[PDB]
Write a protein that binds this DNA or RNA. Sequence first.
DNA 1: GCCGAATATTCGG
DNA 2: CCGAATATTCGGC
Lengths: 94, 110
Amino acid sequence: VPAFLTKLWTLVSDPDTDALICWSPSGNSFHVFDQGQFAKEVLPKYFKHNNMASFVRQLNMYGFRKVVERDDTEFQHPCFLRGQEQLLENIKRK
Amino acid sequence: GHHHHHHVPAFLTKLWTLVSDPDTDALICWSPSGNSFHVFDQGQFAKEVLPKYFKHNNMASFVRQLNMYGFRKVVHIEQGGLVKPDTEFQHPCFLRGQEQLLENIKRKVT
DNA sequence: GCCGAATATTCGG
DNA sequence: CCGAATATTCGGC
Ligand code: NA
Ligand code: NA
C-alpha cells in the first residue's frame, strides 16, 4: 500500500485535525475545511509540499473524485471508508 | 510537463547556483579549471546545502539526479609509492564561464 | 476537476 | 549507477 493512502487514512482519521480534514458523518467521504490553512499547516507534516493542487492530484491519481462561503471541498473513493482500513490494499493507481 | 516556450530543468539552475556560491565552497565548489566540481564532506554537504534547494537532505538522491542528467564521477590515477588515506563530478556541458551550455543538458527518459 | 507527462525522490537490483 | 515505484509539478481540456 503506497504511503499516500496510509498517510491520508491517518490524517483524515486523526481527531486532532478534524477542524481541517475529517470523515463525513456517514463515513463514505472526507471534508477539507479552510483549504488555505490546511495546505500550509497540515500537508507539510505528511508530504514534501504545501500545495492543495498536488494533494488533489494524488487523490485523483488513486481515483478519488470531488463530491458535488467557506473554501471547503469534499472527496470520495468507493474504498476509502471510515473503519474499513483494509480496503486500501486494493486501491491502485488508474 | 515542462514549459512550452523554453525549458531549463530546475535541477540544473539549482546545481549551477549552489556550486558557484562562494558561501558553499568549503563543501561544494568548481575545480580550478572550471570543468568539474568537488564535494567535500558529503555528510555535512547533504545536511547543510541540499535542503536549501531540494525537498530532501540525501546525498543519494542528489547523486541520482546527477547521474540522471549525465554527470559522472571523476576518478584520478594514484601516482607515487607513499600510502594515501571527497568526491568529484563532471559533465561535458557543465563548464564555468560557458554558462549557456547548461541549456543543452537533457535528463534521461524513464 | 481530472488526467497526461516531465521532473523529482525513494528503494531495490 | 540504473530501472522502477511513487511523488511533485506543469499544463491541457
Ligand atoms: Na481528522
Ligand atoms: Na560553492
